[PDB]
């Protein structure tokens, strides 16, 4: 299938999450996503077909993971933006206060700014440190999803946030949103991955 | 392109404001280390900020005198605590929690407000207060703030 950031994928035919970014580890193809989305070996499927399995993951503590796919998968250096697509051109980390947008199967393509870095989150499953905070809204299912700058610089993958009863924080003012994401670079660097850029 | 609309929609960044914004974003990235070295141990962080007229600017903070920088276009701000200072407080909270904390959402160093922010669920400020105190962190460098909803993985 066409591996693109922001699209929905299921795990063990039981839960939903979003694709982060297409990557390669040598000759191996794959994609980064959130660690809480699945456990090692868990099976990932896009549109019904098995595309690969979770090769590794850390959560809590961190919230990262990557899925190694089959040779038949097509890796595109893009991020879904509604019907359009933003081109991934690199992984340069943006500064606090920078404009950043995210994509996920639940809320689509939303923008906001980076408001804090190295955030420690008190998740029911355990604390996760080193997260970056932004005020673009998101909802459940958006996890693993891509966070990218207006110029295509890949920032990270969606981890969590202060969702409301409706399942997201789009209903509360930006000034009060806490949307967190795991930084991309430490993921690429830990699993010796290389981002697919265009 | 199609991204331009989202920028105007959620950030009020209009087309004529894009270039200035972009220029400011490049400066924050390329100068960051330089700004950090220049202020040494008195460095209190940097970040991009928006004026009320629309323009953007790069702000650098310091706990010492400074008054200005060797790099043009960098509004300097004098603040009480230094980054190393706030970082130590951050470490004290990370440890205190490393030992759960119902009502406490998250915490982080926030240079923008020269303080360590501790977010708690609405009407859970007490748990925040206790968290800080039990960690033996200088309550002077810690700001507790309410946060709606519940923090959770999504």
UniProtKB/Swiss-Prot annotation, chain B:
Residues 1-154 form a propeptide. Coiled coil: none annotated. It comes from the Bacteria. Belongs to the peptidase S1 family. This is Alpha-lytic protease. It comes from Lysobacter enzymogenes. The lineage of its organism: Bacteria, Pseudomonadati, Pseudomonadota, Gammaproteobacteria, Lysobacterales.
